[PDB]
Write a protein that binds this ligand. Structure first.
Ligand SMILES: COc1cc(C)cc2oc(=O)cc(CP(=O)(O)O)c12
Ligand SMILES: [Zn+2]
Ligand SMILES: [Zn+2]
Length: 229
């Protein structure tokens, strides 16, 4: 299932969909894995999230060149923290168009991130305003409300059973919601449930820090979040 490629790991989840995994030795927390996605849409490739670093993100592009060998049309990043946005410069060096929540781009400088080139905005119900996500193919971008951070966004893959929760969603056996230092404790539970309701047919839930799981990842994350209120 897992393919080791240098210091990174890649796993095919479905036809046209792979999970990328990178690791950073965070002092006091061990070597933390972070997951994103790679999607083939016809003759082009779409990326969800960078790796932790520019060098690791360049390695993602190298793997894409070896295993898919099609241009990367765009990347979308799911919030302004290092595990999701730390490799923005590598995407720009490669000529890839980059997208993030407008709020992520506003927060990026003070968070130590490089902003994406383009800003997504969202309707009151959470769905991306379509003009701000042009040519996204099967990617369906949804802002579920504040949770892990105020700017966290999520992505479904049309034509598959897959939806991606980023750092908002933890697996069905997770012991806690992890670092809540930037989190919205009042709204987390509703935001997790809003993600599940936005993608009701997704039976494979992908997330930043655990392997793909069933929808019990959503119910368990929300149930743990109920206790924050
Ligand atoms: C940004 O990421 C992290 C940073 C640091 C310094 C420690 C961490 O320790 C963990 O065990 C999990 C993460 C990922 P998270 O902040 O939950 O998105 C992590
Ligand atoms: Zn974060
Ligand atoms: Zn994370």
């Amino acid at each position: 299932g897992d393919q080791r490629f240098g210091d990174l790991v890649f796993r095919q989840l479905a036809p046209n969909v792979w999970q990328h995994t990178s690791y950073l030795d965070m002092p006091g927390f061990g070597a933390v894995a972070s997951n994103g996605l790679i999607v083939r849409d016809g003759g082009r490739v779409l990326v969800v999230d960078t790796a932790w670093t520019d060098d690791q993100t360049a390695q993602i592009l190298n793997w894409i060149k070896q295993e898919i060998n099609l241009p990367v049309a765009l990347a979308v990043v799911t919030h302004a923290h290092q595990d999701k946005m730390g490799g923005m410069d590598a995407l720009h060096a490669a000529g890839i168009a980059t997208y993030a929540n407008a709020l992520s781009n506003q927060l990026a400088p003070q968070e130590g991130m490089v902003a994406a080139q383009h800003s997504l905005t969202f309707a009151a119900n959470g769905w991306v305003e379509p003009a701000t996500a042009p040519n996204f193919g099967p990617l369906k971008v949804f802002y579920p409300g504040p949770g892990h951070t105020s700017d966290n966004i999520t992505v479904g893959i049309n034509g598959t059973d897959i939806a991606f929760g980023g750092c908002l969603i933890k697996d069905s056996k997770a012991k806690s919601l992890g670092n809540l230092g930037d989190a919205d404790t009042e709204h987390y539970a509703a935001s997790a449930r809003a993600f599940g309701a936005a993608f009701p047919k997704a039976s494979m839930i992908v997330m930043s820090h655990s392997a793909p799981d069933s929808r019990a990842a959503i119910t368990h994350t929300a149930r743990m979040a109920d206790k924050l209120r």
